[PDB]
Design a binder for this molecule. Structure first.
Ligand SMILES: Nc1nc2c(ncn2[C@@H]2O[C@H](COP(=O)(O)OP(=O)(O)OP(=O)(O)O)[C@@H](O)[C@H]2O)c(=O)[nH]1
Ligand SMILES: Nc1nc2c(ncn2[C@@H]2O[C@H](COP(=O)(O)OP(=O)(O)OP(=O)(O)O)[C@@H](O)[C@H]2O)c(=O)[nH]1
Ligand SMILES: [Mg+2]
Ligand SMILES: [Mg+2]
Lengths: 415, 137, 180, 18, 180
């Protein structure tokens, strides 16, 4: 229940503001910057600010803080969801999130803000629906918003019905400094870019453990996702009733389902780090990486970031496979590898000097994270059964999907 | 299917070698379609197995069934889930409609000896579906 | 098919061979590897990761992958066991307390079905002080005679002196290569 | 081709489930 | 790449080398540095800070950074150890009481991993009175033979006379430069 949502800037200048209820004066935004500065200087800065009896919730954007001032005890979750929807709409409409587009599309920005929500209650949130009624370069509102199916616009015609799926896998491993993995969770991502004619209703079917158990086929490799979140077009009633994933696919790229379950398997890459740091004399980087993934799978664009000393200089790298580059801005050496086949063993030997004068304050031990991304690999073993594409007119669809495995929160605790 | 005919003798030899009673990861072939075996495809596979032999009368085993399913998936891309047997005790009808292969006793259900037997009526009569309507949805 | 190219390659030497570097930490494994590859006693920090190098002798390029005996690196020795044809064990004759740990690590490594075709190669390290054991006391303590189906040879090598490395290399070559 | 796994054809449903 | 410029530079002499000035305070280190650079016995106050100079001999510009042996300057010797390739030790043969302190300082300096590639260079200072020891008594007292992996040479140099400085410089050049 934010009184007014405004877009700020890095210098504190409000790029654009639009009051929704009028219960909060527009002058409260000026005091938001000093409050944020005081909180940052004292560590008390929070996204949800509080200017007396009015709370100015702000979200750190790419170039400006999306401050949404509120007066009463409005739904914080609802305000956050509205801000996220507005950010997504802006990203869809404007490819750049900076001050360049804030002052360049104000004429359409004001109309979009007015149409998005009224009296603090959001009304329009579909990017396609908003673009079909508000454009930067007006007819009556589309019937899709008024109709029940607000995620699949009717009347779409395409020469061919091709849908591109993406089996995105996020391998997050939390290995402590003792060598034991604490947080090992893999979050699935079923994103499909449906581009066909009409408004077909997708009939999702995969090798789900729950579905296999219900159908009596709970003996093969079935993916048991601890948390599965359906898309907006996905009907929750069918999923709750018999796990039937029946919903109208969106027009374009959309996230239908997102699996999320813990992983009890060994990490795809086993990295052993050695720190032979002398007392203000030299430093040793005994980094050894072992590929625990299948040999048939190669990790493309693997970048194992090893945090080097903050004041370290004149470093020498003695590695075997993969180029190592030290970035002064990042204050660490990333073990960049173009192609890393499964089972590969890369050994590195860092050697650099240190300044004679010791540091005045400690800098901490940031965890070592890798940027491995091996596609065409299904670590979870979940196999899609079929995709029920049904249209009233009747057409033969040719859906496509690719399985991509990448490294997410694969951070290794430093010694 | 020349590839299927070639793989049938090796699969039969591997099944015979395995008694009736190391690499991690899940690599996927690029561009290879994956879908469950159809009723017509299951019937054709059962007929081919019956004609070539080595499937009817063989002792049913978990290792042999897994090897056969893996060979079928490698040769045609069909998921190794349609080669299921009906719940016991007794003769286990095919889980997927259209399958011409079923497991029947040859003498706890696990300790009972099962043997693969051809069944033409299985492809036309949903015995497994009738026995377990809940499993068939 | 034709094997003329293989015969031509083997006439002048084509066999390379492989080797592994295992043992207790600070047991001279890195120093032994440096002596085998370079030939000098090079001072190095603890083996946090691993050392990879190759040694050419008798027309055979036996690559040696030195692995430390640290707790954080002991479980990592299985990574180097893949695609490995040889294994060299470094013992600590001057470290009585670490002798039991080294023996336990060797027994655990030898109890793996993957490392079965590799012959035993134990180097009598710490051969610079009178406290170092002989070629029989160390073998008896480690129980090398109880390793069935394992070709183990006892060789004493001193990192500072370098004597005995040639004998161990010859024994390893004889165990691996059985040609004229 | 494309990095991250080549696109593969998908079926319409589980043909073995009737 | 091309190394024609490097060869042309080395044909007429390009190597410079480095050196360090360490030892006990009032041990002739500053006088030795003045003799090496200028060639006269110049009287100077205590080395509160440090003396930086360069000496050119045999086409090599060996810069010498004299450091005093004072308590407030002894811990500062680590600052000059960075980017240092040579080290010259000044002993006090006429200072029996300070001999133990100089030996302890030399042992502490030699016990640093950073100063490992620098060869030992001890100058027999105070070589003007009969109380000064010979080239073997000073080395035995300092335990130069117990410094493993250290190339130490005993040279006697008198600040007033200047004899022996050439021998020490030649020994240092031979230790550092191994060319024709
Ligand atoms: N002085 C001396 N030390 C020896 C001798 N033999 C073995 N060592 C020990 O062997 C160690 C060699 O260390 P490294 O070169 O780093 O190789 P390492 O044996 O694998 O030791 P780590 O790197 O810590 O795993 C030295 O620290 C010595 O303590 C010897 O004959 N003389
Ligand atoms: N008269 C005489 N004095 C010598 C001789 N050799 C060494 N010395 C002593 O060496 C000292 C030289 O002092 P400095 O020129 O200041 O250099 P230093 O040895 O580093 O002394 P500090 O500056 O105090 O650190 C003199 O004070 C002498 O006492 C020598 O042969 N004759
Ligand atoms: Mg080592
Ligand atoms: Mg002085």
């Amino acid at each position: 229940s934010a009184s007014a949502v405004y877009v700020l800037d890095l210098k504190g200048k409000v790029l654009i503001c639009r009051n929704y209820r009028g219960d909060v004066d527009m002058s409260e935004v000026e005091h938001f910057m000093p409050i944020l500065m005081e909180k940052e200087e004292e560590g008390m800065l929070s996204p949800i600010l509080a200017h007396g009896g009015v709370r100015f919730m702000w979200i750190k954007h790419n170039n400006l803080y999306l401050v949404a001032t509120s007066k009463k005890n409005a739904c914080v979750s609802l305000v956050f969801s509205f801000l996220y929807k507005v950010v997504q709409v802006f990203s869809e409409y404007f490819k750049e999130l900076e001050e360049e587009s804030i002052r360049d599309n104000f004429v359409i920005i004001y109309e979009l803000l007015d149409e998005l929500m009224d009296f603090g209650y959001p009304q329009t949130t579909d990017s396609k629906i908003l673009q079909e009624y508000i454009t930067q370069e007006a007819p009556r509102p589309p019937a899709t918003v008024t109709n029940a199916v607000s995620w699949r616009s009717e009347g779409i015609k395409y020469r061919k019905n091709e849908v591109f799926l993406d089996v995105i896998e996020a391998v997050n491993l939390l290995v402590s400094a003792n060598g034991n993995v604490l947080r090992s969770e893999i979050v699935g991502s079923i994103k499909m870019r449906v581009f066909l004619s009409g408004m077909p209703e997708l009939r999702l079917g995969l090798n789900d453990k729950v579905l296999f158990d219900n159908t009596g086929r709970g003996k093969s490799k079935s993916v048991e996702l601890e948390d599965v979140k359906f898309h907006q077009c996905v009907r929750l009633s069918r999923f709750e009733n018999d796990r039937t994933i029946s919903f109208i696919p969106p027009d374009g790229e959309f996230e239908l389902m997102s699996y999320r379950l813990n992983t009890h398997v060994k990490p795809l890459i086993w990295i052993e780090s050695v720190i032979e740091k002398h007392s203000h004399s030299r430093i040793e980087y005994m980094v050894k990486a072992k590929s625990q993934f299948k040999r048939r799978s190669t990790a493309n664009n693997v970048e194992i970031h090893i945090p080097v000393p903050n004041d370290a200089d004149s470093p020498k790298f003695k590695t075997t496979v993969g180029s190592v580059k030290w970035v002064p801005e990042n204050s660490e050496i990333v073990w960049s590898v173009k192609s890393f086949p499964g089972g590969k063993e890369y050994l590195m030997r860092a050697h650099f000097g240190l300044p004679s004068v010791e540091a005045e304050d400690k800098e901490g031990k940031p965890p070592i994270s890798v940027k491995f991304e091996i596609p065409y690999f299904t670590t979870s073993g979940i196999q899609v059964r079929y995709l029920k594409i049904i249209e009233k007119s009747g057409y033969q669809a040719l859906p496509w999907v690719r399985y991509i495995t990448q490294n997410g929160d694969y951070q290794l605790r430093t010694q | 299917s020349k590839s299927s005919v070639i793989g049938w003798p090796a699969v039969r030899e591997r099944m015979r070698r395995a008694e009736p009673a190391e690499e991690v990861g899940f690599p996927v072939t690029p561009q290879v379609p994956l879908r469950p075996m159809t009723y017509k495809a299951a019937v054709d596979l059962s007929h081919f197995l019956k004609e070539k032999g080595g499937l009817e009368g063989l002792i049913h085993s978990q290792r042999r069934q897994d090897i056969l399913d893996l060979w079928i998936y490698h040769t045609q891309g069909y998921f190794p889930d349609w080669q299921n047997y009906t719940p016991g005790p007794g003769v286990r009808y095919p889980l997927t409609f259209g399958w011409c292969y079923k497991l029947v006793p040859v003498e706890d259900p696990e300790r009972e000896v099962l043997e693969w037997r051809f069944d033409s009526r299985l492809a036309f009569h949903h015995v497994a579906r009738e026995l377990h309507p809940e499993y068939f949805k | 098919g034709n094997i003329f190219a293989n015969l031509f390659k083997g006439l002048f030497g084509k066999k390379e061979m492989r080797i592994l570097m295992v043992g207790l930490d600070a047991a001279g494994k890195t120093t032994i590897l440096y002596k085998l590859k370079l030939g000098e006693i090079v001072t190095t920090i603890p083996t946090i990761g691993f050392n990879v190098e190759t040694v050419e002798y008798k027309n055979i390029s036996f690559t040696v992958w030195d692995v430390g005996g640290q707790d954080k690196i002991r479980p990592l020795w299985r990574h180097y066991f893949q695609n490995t044809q040889g294994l060299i064990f470094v013992v600590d004759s001057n470290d009585r307390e670490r002798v039991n740990e080294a023996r336990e690590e060797l027994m655990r490594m030898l109890a793996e079905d993957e490392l079965r075709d590799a012959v035993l190669l134990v180097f009598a390290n710490k051969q610079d002080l009178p406290n170092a054991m002989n070629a029989a006391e160390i073998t008896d303590k480690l129980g090398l005679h109880s390793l069935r189906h394992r070709n183990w040879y006892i060789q004493a090598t001193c990192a500072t002196s370098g004597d005995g490395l040639y004998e161990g290399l010859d024994w390893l070559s004889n165990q691996l290569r059985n040609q004229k | 081709d494309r990095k991250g796994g080549s696109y593969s054809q998908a079926a319409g449903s589980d043909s073995a489930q009737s």
